[PDB]
Structure formats: C-alpha cells, structure tokens
Amino acid sequence: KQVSWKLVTEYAMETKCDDVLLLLGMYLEFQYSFEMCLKCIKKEQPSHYKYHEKHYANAAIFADSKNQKTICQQAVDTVLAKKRVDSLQLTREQMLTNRFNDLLDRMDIMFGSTGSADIEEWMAGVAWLHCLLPKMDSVVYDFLKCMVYNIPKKRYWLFKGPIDSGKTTLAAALLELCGGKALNVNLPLDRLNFELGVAIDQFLVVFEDVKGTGGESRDLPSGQGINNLDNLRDYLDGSVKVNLEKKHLNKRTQIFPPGIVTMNEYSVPKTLQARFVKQIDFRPKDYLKHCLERSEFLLEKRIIQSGIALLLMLIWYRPVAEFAQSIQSRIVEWKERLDKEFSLSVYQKMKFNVAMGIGVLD
Amino acid sequence: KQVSWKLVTEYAMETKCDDVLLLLGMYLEFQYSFEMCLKCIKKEQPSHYKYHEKHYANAAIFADSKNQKTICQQAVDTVLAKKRVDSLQLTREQMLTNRFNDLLDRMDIMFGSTGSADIEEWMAGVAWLHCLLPKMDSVVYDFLKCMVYNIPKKRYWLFKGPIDSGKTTLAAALLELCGGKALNVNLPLDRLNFELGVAIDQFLVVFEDVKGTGGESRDLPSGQGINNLDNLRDYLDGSVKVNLEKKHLNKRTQIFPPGIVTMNEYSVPKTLQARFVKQIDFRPKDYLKHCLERSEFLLEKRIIQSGIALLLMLIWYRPVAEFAQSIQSRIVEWKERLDKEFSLSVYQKMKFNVAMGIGVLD
Amino acid sequence: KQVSWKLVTEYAMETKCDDVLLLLGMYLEFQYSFEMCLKCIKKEQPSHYKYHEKHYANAAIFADSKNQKTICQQAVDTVLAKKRVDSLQLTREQMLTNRFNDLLDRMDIMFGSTGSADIEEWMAGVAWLHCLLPKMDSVVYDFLKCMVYNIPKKRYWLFKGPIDSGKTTLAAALLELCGGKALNVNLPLDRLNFELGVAIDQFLVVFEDVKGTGGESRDLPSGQGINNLDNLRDYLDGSVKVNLEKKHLNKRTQIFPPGIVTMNEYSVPKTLQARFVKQIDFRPKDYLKHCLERSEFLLEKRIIQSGIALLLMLIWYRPVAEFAQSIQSRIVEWKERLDKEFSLSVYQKMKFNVAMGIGVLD
Amino acid sequence: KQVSWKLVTEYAMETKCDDVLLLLGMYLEFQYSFEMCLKCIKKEQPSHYKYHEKHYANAAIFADSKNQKTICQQAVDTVLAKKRVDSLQLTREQMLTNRFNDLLDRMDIMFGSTGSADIEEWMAGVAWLHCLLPKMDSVVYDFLKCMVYNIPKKRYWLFKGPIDSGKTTLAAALLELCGGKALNVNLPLDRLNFELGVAIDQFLVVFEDVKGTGGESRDLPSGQGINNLDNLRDYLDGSVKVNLEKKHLNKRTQIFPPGIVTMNEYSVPKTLQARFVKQIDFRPKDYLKHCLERSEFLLEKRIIQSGIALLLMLIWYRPVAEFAQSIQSRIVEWKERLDKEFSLSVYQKMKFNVAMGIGVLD
Amino acid sequence: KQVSWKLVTEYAMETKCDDVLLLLGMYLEFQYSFEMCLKCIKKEQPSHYKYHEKHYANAAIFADSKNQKTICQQAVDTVLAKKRVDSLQLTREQMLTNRFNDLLDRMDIMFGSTGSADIEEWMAGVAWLHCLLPKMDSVVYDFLKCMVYNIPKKRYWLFKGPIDSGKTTLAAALLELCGGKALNVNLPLDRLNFELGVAIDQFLVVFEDVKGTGGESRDLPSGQGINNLDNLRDYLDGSVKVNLEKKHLNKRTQIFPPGIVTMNEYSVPKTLQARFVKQIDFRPKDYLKHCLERSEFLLEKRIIQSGIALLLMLIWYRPVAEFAQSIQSRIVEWKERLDKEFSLSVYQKMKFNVAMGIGVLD
DNA sequence: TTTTTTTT
Ligand SMILES: Nc1ncnc2c1ncn2[C@@H]1O[C@H](COP(=O)(O)OP(=O)(O)OP(=O)(O)O)[C@@H](O)[C@H]1O
Numbered sequence A, B, C, D, E: 001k002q003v004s005w006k007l008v009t010e011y012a013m014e015t016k017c018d019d020v021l022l023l024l025g026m027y028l029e030f031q032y033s034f035e036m037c038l039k040c041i042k043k044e045q046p047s048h049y050k051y052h053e054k055h056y057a058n059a060a061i062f063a064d065s066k067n068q069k070t071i072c073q074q075a076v077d078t079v080l081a082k083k084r085v086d087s088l089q090l091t092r093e094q095m096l097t098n099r100f101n102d103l104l105d106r107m108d109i110m111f112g113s114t115g116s117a118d119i120e121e122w123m124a125g126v127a128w129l130h131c132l133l134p135k136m137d138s139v140v141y142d143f144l145k146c147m148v149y150n151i152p153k154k155r156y157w158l159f160k161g162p163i164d165s166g167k168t169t170l171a172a173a174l175l176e177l178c179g180g181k182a183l184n185v186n187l188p189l190d191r192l193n194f195e196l197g198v199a200i201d202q203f204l205v206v207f208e209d210v211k212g213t214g215g216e217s218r219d220l221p222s223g224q225g226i227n228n229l230d231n232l233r234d235y236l237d238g239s240v241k242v243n244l245e246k247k248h249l250n251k252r253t254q255i256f257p258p259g260i261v262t263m264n265e266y267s268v269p270k271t272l273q274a275r276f277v278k279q280i281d282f283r284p285k286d287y288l289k290h291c292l293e294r295s296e297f298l299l300e301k302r303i304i305q306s307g308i309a310l311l312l313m314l315i316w317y318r319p320v321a322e323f324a325q326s327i328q329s330r331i332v333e334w335k336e337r338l339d340k341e342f343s344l345s346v347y348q349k350m351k352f353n354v355a356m357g358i359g360v361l362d
Numbered sequence F: 001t002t003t004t005t006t007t008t
C-alpha cells in the first residue's frame, strides 16, 4: 500500500499550516495509536486531538516513507498557493470578515468549558481601553473603515505623545485584530531594503517609534526615521504598485499596505504631515497608572495588548448592522452571551473603578 | 489514467498566468464538481467560472499527482516564452493594439450583465480628468504616439509641479493604460542593479518623485534621485542596448523602455534637461478639490487613477480612424453605446458641475 | 536486503543528534562487531555503548548503502521537526522540566560506578556557591520562578559589582542550568541586528558586561552599551513581539527572552533602572580568594561554573514539593542518595572551612 | 513515438538561437498545421516560415513532451559550444567576414521582394552619415583594420566631447557592424568585477560616457567611472588574458576585447591617456540638425544608428579588393545593385541637401 | 550501442581541455564523416585532425545522446583532478620542467610548418633582449634558479632606476614562463591587508614601483610602501608560513612566495635593504628607444615581453646541461634549428643594429 | 552558488 499525499494536503489545509517542519513534526505524532494517545486523552491541542484518529492509518505508512520531506513540501505549497489566490481575489471587506471569523473561533475556545480565560478579566480590559481615549469604540470603527476603503493618500494615522502613553499598546491590539507586521525604519538605508520586504501580502503595517532629529530639545534621542521616511512618501501614498524584496528571492510588485506611525513628540516635515489623514495625541494619566498598579493581572495575561480585547469592545458597543452580513449571526450569539453574563451596572461599576484609580474589580 | 500537461498549459495560456503559485492555486479549485461550484453559481471570477466545467475532469487527476509543481512550472514557462517571442517580433503598435483589446474585454465585464461598474460614475471621472489640463485628450494622443514611435533620445516626458498637483494621478492612469512599471531611483547606487532589472520586456516605465537637490531652500529634502538619473543617460536615450539583472539569473540585454518622470521642483543638471523631449507643469486648483470633496466615490473606487477612465476619454474624444484597424470595430460599438448611455447635455451638466467645484452629480 | 531508515531515525531521536555529519559518523562505527567492540568494552561513550548491539545489523547494511547522506538528512530532519513542535506547544514549566531531566541523566553517569566525578568535590562546590551571596538557594528559586512566569516588565535582573566579584561565574551557571545565550551590546549600533539575532528561540539571554560612560572617573573604560540598552525598551519589558534576524535568513517575530544584565559600577539612568525587577550586588571577599587557592580542584574541574552544581544546591536545599510533579520522584531518589553520602555535620564543616578561608576539605 | 532532440538542435543552430525561452516559444509555434498557418501565408517572419513545414511533425510530438525545457537547454548549449569553438579557432578576419555575411543576408531580405524598406532612404542615410565627418568611409576602414590587427596599447579609440555631438550615434553603428557589446563602469568595483564577465567571447566592446572628474567645473559630475578605467589598464592595452565571470556557471580567462570608450569633457589621468591610438572628439554642425529635423524618417527608422548604413557606405566607397576575399563576389553583386538604382548625381543631390541642412528627398 | 564515456575522457586528457563548453563543441565536430572531413583536409587544427578518425564512431552516437553535458562534465573533472594531484605532489623543479616543455611546444607552434611568425623576427627580439643590459642570459639564469630554490631570505632582488627603464617590461615577461603576479604597497594599511592577501598560490611574485614615503625629499610622490615593507619582515624572508586574506573570504596559510621589488631611485632603510640579495638599477637608453622605434614588429607580434623570446635567449646562450635533464633533448633539437638557420654574423649584425639603436632586421 | 554578508 502507499501514502496518500491527498490526506496530508488535507491536514495542512485544515490546520492552515505553512511551515514544512511544523507540518512534518505534527503529522509524525499520529503514527502511534490514537487510542492511547495521551495528547488526545488530555485534550491538550485541538490541531492534534481532532485529527489523530482520522489520519492515523496514513501516518503509519508515512512513517515508513523514504520521501517524507518531498510529501510535506507539496502540502505546504498548497497552503501557500491558497493565500496567493485569496490575496488577488477577495475584497478587503471579505478578508476582514475571514480574519474576524478566526478570532471568534479562538474566542470560542478561550471562553469554552476547556476555556481557561476568565471573561470577567477580559471584560475588565475593555473598560481600561475605553478610558484610554475619548469615544474609543468610535475611533476603532473609523480606523477599520479606513483600512477597508484603503483610499490613496488618505491611508495613514499618526500616533504621538510622551513616553508611556499607550500608543504601542494600542497599535499592538489593532495589529493583532487586523493582522499585519511591525517595521523599524530607524536604520541604515541598505538594510532598509530587506526590512520593507516583510510587508508582502500583509494587511496592515505599523512603523514603530520613528526617530526625528533635534528632538534633544525635548531630550529625545535623535535618529534616522523621519528623514528616512520622507524618502518613502510613495509607499505611504499607495497610489501605485511598488517592488518588494526578500533574501535569496526575486521581487514582487504590489501596493504597499495602509497602517500606523508611532512617534515621540518630534516635529515633522509637512511633506509628510500632509500624508497623515489623522493624528491622535496620547497623554499620560495618573488614574490609569494607579488603577493599573492595582489590576496587574491585566498586564500579566497581556489582556491590554490583545486583539481579542478590541473585538470584545466592538461587540459590546457597536450595532449588529455594522458587521458584514455573514458574521452577524455569530455576532448576535456573542452579544447575547455577553449580556447574559454582564449587567450594564457591572460594566459601569468597572469604568467607575478605573476613573477612581482603584483596582478595576470590587 | 494520467494528467494532461497539455490541458494545464492551455489554461495558463488562456488566463495569461505568470505565477506558478497562482496557477497552482486556481487549477486546484477545479477539482470539486462544477455542478455545484458556488463560485460558478455566484459568477464571481471570470477566470474561474468560464473554465471550471472544461478543466474539471483533468483537475481531478491533477489533484492526486505527485509532480504538481513541475507540471505548473512547465505551464508558466510556456506563458513566459510567449511573452519573449512577442516582445521580439511584434511592432510596438501591435503590442498596444493587443493591450487595448484586454482592457476592452475588462470593460465588457465591468459594464456587462454582472455590471458592477456604474458607467455614469466612470464617465464623471472622464470629465474630471479632461478638466485637469487644457486639451487633455490631445495630450494623451501625443504621448501614445511618442511611446509607439520610440524615437531615440526623444523618449521621456517630465512632470513638474508642487504636491497634490495631480501629476502622480495622471501618471498612474497612463501606466495602467500602457502596462509599464514604476521604479524608485532615490535608493543607493548599488541595488539599482536588481531594481532596474524589473524593466525587462516592459513597454513603459515611470520614475517617481525623483529626489534632487537645491529644493532644500523650499523644504524638498534631497537625495540620490537626480544624481542617479544623470548617471543613466544612456538608459534614457535608448540609443543602445543595456544589460539587465535578476537574482539567480544571468543578464538579459535589451533597449530600455521609454516613459515618464515626476518631480517636485528640485534642480536639474541640463544633461538631463536635454533628454526630456517634453515637460508638463501642473498646478493645484481648489475647485477640483471642492469637487472631489463631495464626489468622494471617485477616489474610493480609484476611478480617476485608472487607464480604463483614459480609454473612455479617448473613445469619447477621438476619431475612429486614429485607432488601429482591427479594433476600429470594437471602438465603433463603444462609441454607439456611449451615445446611447449619455446625452451631450448630461456630459455638459457633469463638466459644468466639475467647473463649479460642486459635486459632479445633481 | 534493505536498510531500515526507521532504525536510524530512532537512533537520531534517542541521541537527539542534531548534526548530519555527527549522526553519520557515529552510526558507521556500529558496523564492526559490538561483541568485540573496544569502545563498548571500555564503556567510553554512552551514545555508543548503549546502542551498538541494537543497531549492529542495520549498520552493516547501511555501510553498503549508496544513499548514505540521504538517509541521514531525513533522520536529522525528524529531530529538528520535533524541536519546533515542542517550541510552539510546551509550557515554559514543561520546558524547564525537560531541561532538568537532561541534567539528572548526566549526573547519573557522572556519579555512577563508571562515573569519573567525585560527589564530595561537587558538594564542596555547592558549599562555596552558597557562600557567594546571602540566601543563595532562595535567590535561585526566585530567579527560576521569574523566568518561568515571564511576566511583562518583571523580567530582568541586574548583577552589579567590581571585577573578579563572581558575577560572570553565577551567570554562566544559571545559563547552563536553563540554556540560553550570551550577547554583547557594547557593539556599534549598526551591528546589533545580527547580534540580537542570536536570541532566536532561546530560553534565557545574558548581556555581558555592558559598558557605561563617564565611569572613567572611576577608571571604568567607557562604551556604548548602556545607551544601546536604553534604546531597547520593548525587548526588555517583553510586552509585545519583536522581529529578529539571522545571516542569510528571513526575519522571525517573537517575544524577546528574559535574562540578566551584568556590569561593573557604572552609573545607570533611571529609565533603565525601572526596567529591572531586582538588583544584586556582588562584592569581592578575601576568604573566598584564599579558600580558592587551597581548593583549586574546584577551578580545575570547572565545578563552580556548572549548572550541575546549582542543581545539586537546589536538591539539597529545596522542599520536594517545589519541583514539577513528574520529576519529584527522581528528586526524592537523589535527596536520599545525598542524605546517605553526607551527614549534615560533614556539610556544615565544609561551610565553616570556607568561612575560615581555609581549604574546604579536612 | 518520441521527440527528435536532433531536429530541435538543428533549428537552434540554423536560427543561431541563443536563449532557452526564445527557442521554446519559437518551436511551439510549429505544432499547428503549417498548411494553413497564417504566419506562413503572411511570410511574416523568416525564422518561422522557412521552417514550419519541415519541423511540423517533430513539433507535434514535442508539444506533448514532459521534458520540454531540458530539450531546449541541450540545444542552446550546442549553439554556445559552437560559438566558443569559433571563438578560439578563427582569425579575427575570418570572424569579421562571417559577420558581414549575416548583415548581407538581412539586406537581401530588407530590400528584397518583401522589401519592407527602400534603399533610397537608407542611401540618403548613407549620405547624411558620410557628411558627419570627412571621408567617413576611410576613417571607418582604419577602425576596422585596427580592430582586426588588435595591436596592444595601440588598441582603443576615445570619443571625448560634448553632448549631441553624435559620438554615441557613431559608436552604435560601429558596434552593430562589429557585433560587440556595450559595457558600463560607472559603478561599484564589487559589481564591476562581475559585470565585465559579459566580455566573454566578444569581438569588440564600447564603454559609454564614463564619469570622469574635473568636469564638475563644467557641471559634469565626477564619479567612479574613470577610477575604474585608469585601474584596469591591462584590459585596455590587451596586455594579457584575465578572468571573466558568470552565474551558476564556470568562469573563464581570456584576453579582453579591444574597444572604444566615450565621455564628455572630464579630465583624464595621463596614465590612462597613454593607452589610445586615437583620441578624438566630436562637435555639432547645426545644418545637419535642420536637415534631420526635416528628414525625420531617417531617425524614426533608426537608419543613422544602424550598422547596415555603414555597410552600405563601405559598399559604395571602398574598392572590392579592400574586402576579405571570399565575400568579394557578394560585394560586386551589391555594388551593381547600387549603381543599378542610383546615379552619382542622385547621391550628390542628397549630399548637397544634407550639407545645405534641408529635407533630402526632393 | 552506446556512447563510450571512456573515449571522451581520453580526448579531454589528451587535449587537456578544462572547459565543458569547449569539450562539447569540439567533440561534436567529429560526428560528420571523417572519411571526407574538410577540416582534416585543410590540416587547420591538430586538436581536430589528429583525433577525428579515431573518435568518429563514438562521436556519431554522442550526437544522438540525450545526456551530452553530463558526459562532458565528468570528463572535465578528470582533467581538473589530474592538475590538483600534480599541483600537490610535484617539486618546483618538476613544475618548471613541465612549464618549459609547454613553451617549447609553443615554439613548435610558433615556428611549425605554418611558420606563422618568423623565427628570425623572433631572433630580432632575442637580439633586443640580450642587448638590453649586462650579460642578460646569465642574469636570467641566476634569477631563475634563485626562484626555483626559494631559499629563505635569499629571495628578493631590487630593481631601482627611473621610469621607462624597462624594469616593469622585463619582470612581466618572466611570468609567461612561470606564472605569478605583481602587487601594490603604496597604500594605507587597511588596503595593504587585502593587497598582501592577493598573493596566494603564486609561483613567483613582483611589486609595483615603491612610491617610497621618506623618499619624497628626492622630489618624488609617495605611498606608505617603505614603512610597509620594512615592517613586513617575514614575508620577504619566507622563513615561516604566513596568513593571507581576501574580500568576503577566509584566511589561507602558506610561505610567502619569492619575487622582485621595483622602484625609482627612492630612499631605503638599511633594514629594508637587508631584505634583498641584489641591488639593480635600470635606465632608459638612447639606442634602445630608437631601436624599438625602428623595430616595432617586435612589439607588433608581442615578442619583447613574450616568454618565448626569453626561452630562445636561453636556448641560444645556455648550454644543454643547464636545462632540465630530459628536456635537454628538445634543447639540442632547437639548438640544431637556431644554429643552422642563423649565422652568428646575422645574430651579431642584429645585436650590432641594436647597439647602433637602428632597425634590427637590416 | 548565488546570495547575503562583507566591505565600506
Ligand atoms: N496613558 C497612560 N497613562 C499612564 N500610564 C500609561 C498610559 N499608557 C500606558 N501606560 C503605562 O505605560 C506602559 C507602557 O505602555 P506603552 O508601551 O504602550 O507605551 P508607549 O508610550 O506607547 O511606548 P513606546 O513609545 O515605547 O511605544 C503601560 O504598560 C502602562 O503601564
């Protein structure tokens, strides 16, 4: 008898795996009998225990194969090929709904019975976020629309404020929400060529704490970033395709993604200021700090950074109508679950705690 | 029974697919029964639903194959070979005649039964562009002739003007129309080597916002742009072939394509000034801004950036005799459709609104 | 008759052999008769003598294969695949538990009957380390807990004090205990990128001997390192993911490991001071120096450098419940062995000798 | 039945086709019935219509093969091998008379029954070019002989002098005649080293407008060009064989071809100036401009760039005995055809119109 | 029946072909009927006509092979392997022995039955050479044996004296008979590192004219060469191995080869002087300039810096016993020719013509 | 083996 390459390709597809080693190592685990498989029995990893029993017989024959890496290479190509197809054919709206469907699926586990997460802790995080800026949930919705529409020369938001004002915290959550990559452009102009390479097929990008010059007036360290960015104004404008590069790999040509720039309080060339559609001023606030000092499970579990938290905020605040049609059914079910588990008074009590700088809980 | 490599190759010719992963991805979709293929039923992508029923039988056998990437590679080579043959044997006029047929096919879809494009919005865009400069349609015809004739050392048009003058917007539409590439020359002088290698077999090129000097007086921060271009006089002149470069590939020798450069008003060594056969100067004009500020669907659908819009302009403004004979038939049908779909009064109403800076529609 | 690739892969898994050439060389040795094998008879290397008799038959056929390196590559891939699976799935507590099992296996050999080590000399090592700082064993337990929880901000420890005050000694033993890498941030800012690349997939990092500035007032040579660290805030706080680079490789994105910073008595910015959960002062003490003179078998055998010594310290001092439940069984057996071989009076006599600055043994 | 790789390789030889993609594309055209082939019917391309009938049967079987690129790779190597064998064995005269036969074969077609351009125009181009400098034919005959004899140090000719002197125009015609290569050195030495590899197996080379120094007083930017020139003096002198480079392929050592190098009026190291038997510059004669401006089919059809124009000029001006012996049959035959279609008075009419600076074809 | 790979390998060995393309090309020529092979009839190339008849049948089958380049790659490996064996095994004397035998075969070419350069035009070269300076044949023989023995310290001679003195001209000529290279030290030490590192595996070496700093007081330009070489004690002495280095390459270890230093009349430290066996100074000579001016055929066929002209000078002056013991056969066989064809009077006439500075071939 | 890294 012979290996079914088809079943391996299915497993790669269903796990959305695209590392040949991870795929290989995972598939090899199935060669022992699932009936005693302690990973199955302890229900430790779904990407194992869902599949072991299905794939078992083929895994045993695969364990004898002399071609093992070639089989995995073909499977990984298929997963990569599907991403390529999607990049050229989905609407930006559909991409976002797909991404949301995956987060919602992860939320299904986290707050499941096997779910380790305390939904009350995660809901506490939403209170702290809704304090960080005026009209926070409206700001998120405006950003999401901006990213979907991707209007040329109206594509980039500037975050600036003192050190320790939560700008990278907020960027992290948006980036996990949408998917994308961070970039560092405080660099020499040569390595920069490969640095920009990682934007390929990404949805967002974030430029992390770019450095101005002469900021030592405000005691800011000076550096490359701003002067270096002004050369790349084309990539911001997104008005035409550009050519992007990776190590040992020939170029690809695409429009450079929309995104966010984070910055200390340097000044900026208005040639670049003109390219930011919007600017948000962050500020340190004492009650956030004193609340947070008394609420450190927020930090310990990274709740405040995580896109799951922003999604929960939108589900709480926004009308069902604002979500694209197919996910509205899941959105309604989560809304019901949230309202069942939390009164408004409980949420308002939490917000009042944050304002009072006590620990969020009481 | 065995895979027809011939049928795969034929699909790649039919679709003009260049990427082995994109080819692989799309051919796999045909493995499921077209009898119920939701993509077919929803009529979403022409390159799928036209072909699924035909290729289904072969795709089922391809889905089992162990060679898959090899079969796709040969198919992609066949498409690339056809481009090489065409590049060496067509007149530039035939190349453009082919390009127009492809756009016209896309227009037949866009405004066809599936009809996703509103021809009213698209024609409103034509009025906006025809307003952007005097005698706009005449200027387009001049540029096309210049690119077709490709007279040596009379090959390049310079666009100069301040920010938001619209020069990029015009250049973007022209690039789509002819199918060129955009290139960045403000980079360091080394990886220009792999950068300019993108121009292999291209019809047209545009260099974007070439960073010069002297403009620091006016807050144009300077760079290698003008330095690098004056280093490349022969590439502009197209007087003799040059070598071009790609990773893991030996050099290709050919004449460098004609085209366009965009400039905020840095200084220019007159060794470059000699080589631009023409320069056009652009100016911001507030009433256009007030127009877009209401008619924002122009930007959101990117209408004013598209070669599709320029093609519609030419069909409106030019004699049928200016077009190559083989398409004059298709041109006549589109002229007829346009006269049916719009009265001159409607177009005059639009163009009046554009001049008023009110929203184009009323 | 055929080679069993399976038996090779099993050997590679059991030896955890990462390198193809090392794997190849060792397997070939088995082709001679284990029954006469001098290396077996002299019990020189466990990775040989445990295995020779089992693999002999397959090694004989392997010796005639024409595919030899191909067999080894597939085997080595299996070992690498296992590591990446583990990296993405194990808890940090699981990782540490595995690491301890490895050390315990080496100790079983070292102090075995074949064992060349002397448990008494190695216990003399523990007495010296326990004198290096107050409450040494509690300090280790605290450090380990901090690494396992990896709580944001609460992640990094500072070792401070003069030259030859022992800080590097303790760093090295901890680094051996946990596994990890040393890094040197005194470099000029451009080279740091590949330097930090070393951190990829590590459990710990140690920053060696970061040079401040202006400590030359105290004869300390000045350097960049302190400023470089103050510019790496997110790497230390560990709240969000970071991109990391290696030579000829594409970047990977992960949370930067926790770790240790070591320095002489440079002044430290408050911005940097706030990064550290804890600071430990090392001071030179003469009685340790005079003891080391008279007890230099400690240095010669590198006892005081080794994680093996720290593990013995944990076994002697900590309650059994403090260890991960699985290994508690082995821990009891080692505690029992140590209790048998040393009365507390013997151990305390050694501690007294170190306090005298006299030789440890009497 | 199976593909004849032999018949494929014959086509590659007889086309002298030298690119694997071009060859692949070309041969696949033959898979259709030649009996109805539109290209055959058009007599569109000789390299098709001469061969379609002969290769049809083999091309049909080739069209089904799975090895298609491998077949073409072997065929291409046969053509490269033939070139390398000629490269060493032939005398420089024997090479040149082969080159002339190829050009004569084109002219037989160009002015043939297909006749796609008319010798009156090309002869007018001869008149324009003979007008460009005194006794043009004689100066050409010197250059040809100098390149055949290839005397060291007395080996290269300079074209210094202003923009739009036509110096590049003359270089292009000579290079087309000789079948050399252009090369660039205005470059980093660490890619210059590999770029020169194109010099393998070339009769002649040309270096274009190389960046000197001192010319910055005349706005000519100084640069790497002349540094790289005055370095490699061996290559200029042709003093000894030296190595040359290719990707994924063996290097080669051989003497460097003789050549021309061109500049505008930079300064030049006398250490370099030593190495040039002729050291000439070129300056505008404005009436020719006014003629060309009124004779633009000359420039549009690139006639005054072509090598064909030089060969026509030599056929007119030179004695039959000045040519290599074997071709003198064809030389006489073409000398007839000129005289059969032109009086001297017609040629002199053209030349006075040119000298007068007026549209030629009265 | 099938291609003998063996026969191909014999031909490669017999012709000492290093290049897979040459081997392929030439071997394919044998496929045509030997019995009327017109290249054989013309006796153009021994590498063909000596072999075709033997290889014919195999070459026919070779031309039908589908595998051709693979056969040639193995054959080329055989020749390279042969070289690398001998390169490691043999003595410097054996190496020079074979190098003589090669260039004696080059004489058998130069004056074979085609006589394609006149043996006595070459004798006129020998005259100009021996007329150059005192006793030149002995000075050659001494320097040659000095370089063969490579005795420590006794390894470097100093060619002082002004420009155009011939010191460059002569030393370069010896390298034809030896291999080797010349190198630069007029440079700051960061260059000098790589510059020294060039010299790997050279049989002999030379230095560029030392522009001695500390010698500018003689009204001369300088580079750092004096302090450089005076510090480079070991490399000159050749008493021990040293390490050598190149861009992007690791170090290599060898005894630094022996050689020649050249300069104008610069200053020298007594220590740097102690590095040399001989001080020489050259000068331009009024007879010799006017002789070459009147004798330029010696330059035209590259005689005056050929090695063959030195070989003939040796075969003239030096007795048979002074040559490699078996090669002495050939020495007699050329003494036969030279002493037959040339009277001492024509030799003395030629020498006297150089002594009068007049044209040698009176 | 190119490439990326080195080199700069
Ligand atoms: N608005 C705020 N007021 C007070 N403390 C804040 C505020 N925002 C963040 N913090 C505290 O500062 C810590 C760091 O937050 P964060 O990393 O997002 O700051 P940042 O200023 O955006 O950083 P960076 O400029 O380095 O990207 C938080 O974990 C929290 O403890």
Ligand SMILES: Nc1ncnc2c1ncn2[C@@H]1O[C@H](COP(=O)(O)OP(=O)(O)OP(=O)(O)O)[C@@H](O)[C@H]1O
Pocket: A153, A239, B161, B162, B163, B164, B165, B166, B167, B168, B169, B170, B209, B262, B263, B264, B283, B284, B285, B286, B288, B289, B292
């Ligand atoms: N002539 C114009 N008058 C007013 N607004 C204009 C004009 N042209 C363009 N715009 C506005 O400016 C935006 C950007 O135009 P565009 O990028 O083409 O200008 P540009 O001069 O090429 O700019 P840049 O040098 O920044 O790339 C357009 O999307 C439109 O909103």
Ligand SMILES: Nc1ncnc2c1ncn2[C@@H]1O[C@H](COP(=O)(O)OP(=O)(O)OP(=O)(O)O)[C@@H](O)[C@H]1O
Pocket: C132, C161, C162, C163, C164, C165, C166, C167, C168, C169, C170, C209, C263, C264, C282, C283, C284, C285, C286, C288, C289, C292
């Ligand atoms: N507390 C101590 N008192 C006296 N001597 C010490 C002490 N600790 C270490 N030593 C001596 O110092 C030597 C070096 O130890 P170690 O490298 O750990 O010192 P360090 O302070 O970390 O130095 P550095 O910062 O230079 O690496 C040890 O081998 C030992 O001889």
Ligand SMILES: Nc1ncnc2c1ncn2[C@@H]1O[C@H](COP(=O)(O)OP(=O)(O)OP(=O)(O)O)[C@@H](O)[C@H]1O
Pocket: B153, B233, B239, D161, D162, D163, D164, D165, D166, D167, D168, D169, D170, D209, D263, D264, D282, D283, D284, D285, D286, D287, D288, D289, D292
């Ligand atoms: N006698 C002339 N009078 C006027 N223009 C001339 C004359 N000869 C040549 N030119 C012009 O020179 C233009 C460019 O020619 P060419 O590129 O060969 O010159 P060049 O000196 O090599 O220039 P560059 O230094 O810019 O490369 C031609 O298009 C031609 O019109």
Ligand SMILES: Nc1ncnc2c1ncn2[C@@H]1O[C@H](COP(=O)(O)OP(=O)(O)OP(=O)(O)O)[C@@H](O)[C@H]1O
Pocket: E161, E162, E163, E164, E165, E166, E167, E168, E169, E170, E209, E263, E264, E282, E283, E284, E285, E286, E288, E289, E292
């Ligand atoms: N002694 C001589 N007298 C006259 N002409 C000579 C003499 N030697 C060589 N020549 C001619 O002069 C040319 C230059 O000689 P060469 O470069 O060898 O001299 P050099 O002294 O090494 O010069 P430099 O120190 O300037 O590099 C030779 O190639 C030859 O044509």
